[PDB]
């Protein structure tokens, strides 16, 4: 098990509204991984873009971690690490940006 | 739904 408390992009268990209050004041590409208060042990990537905070479910299925079925990872850390370098465009044309800046910057 | 949808 990986301890995600280490990373400056992990916000723990935090509500959707609190996330839009926290991220609205930052540049596009600022992101955080949070745990969804309504689904225990399920996570979300929240990322500011176009002056609005977008939210993406992290699905866990058949031991894969993924935000699109077309690209899968062994772990949440590897997911985040891939999308820090490769734009979300390849599966979210609504959202052309990498995970550039963790919110604790 | 509620979140963002892929593709």
Author numbering:
A (entry chain C): 665 to 769
B (entry chain A): -1 to 5
The authors write:
Here, we report that Vav2, a guanine nucleotide exchange factor (GEF) for Rho family GTPase, is a novel interaction partner of APP. Through its SH2 domain, Vav2 can bind to the tyrosine-phosphorylated cytoplasmic domains of several membrane receptors and then mediate different extracellular signals to intracellular responses. Increasing evidence has shown that the tyrosine phosphorylation site Y682 in the intracellular tail of APP is crucial for APP function. Our research demonstrated that Vav2 can interact with APP through its SH2 domain which binds directly to the Y682-phosphorylated APP intracellular tail.
ITC reported a binding Kd of 0.86 μM for Vav2-SH2 in complex with APP-pY682 peptide and no binding of Vav2-SH2 and APP-Y682. The peptide lies in an extended backbone conformation roughly perpendicular to the central β-strands of the SH2 domain. Residue N684′ (pY + 2) does not interact with SH2 domain. However, when bound to Grb2-SH2 domain the peptide adopts a U-shape conformation. This is due to the presence of a bulky Tryptophan residue (W121) in the EF loop of Grb2-SH2, which is a Threonine residue (T732) at the corresponding position of Vav2-SH2. ITC experiments showed that mutation of R680 to Ala in Vav2-SH2 domain nearly abolished its binding with APP-pY682.
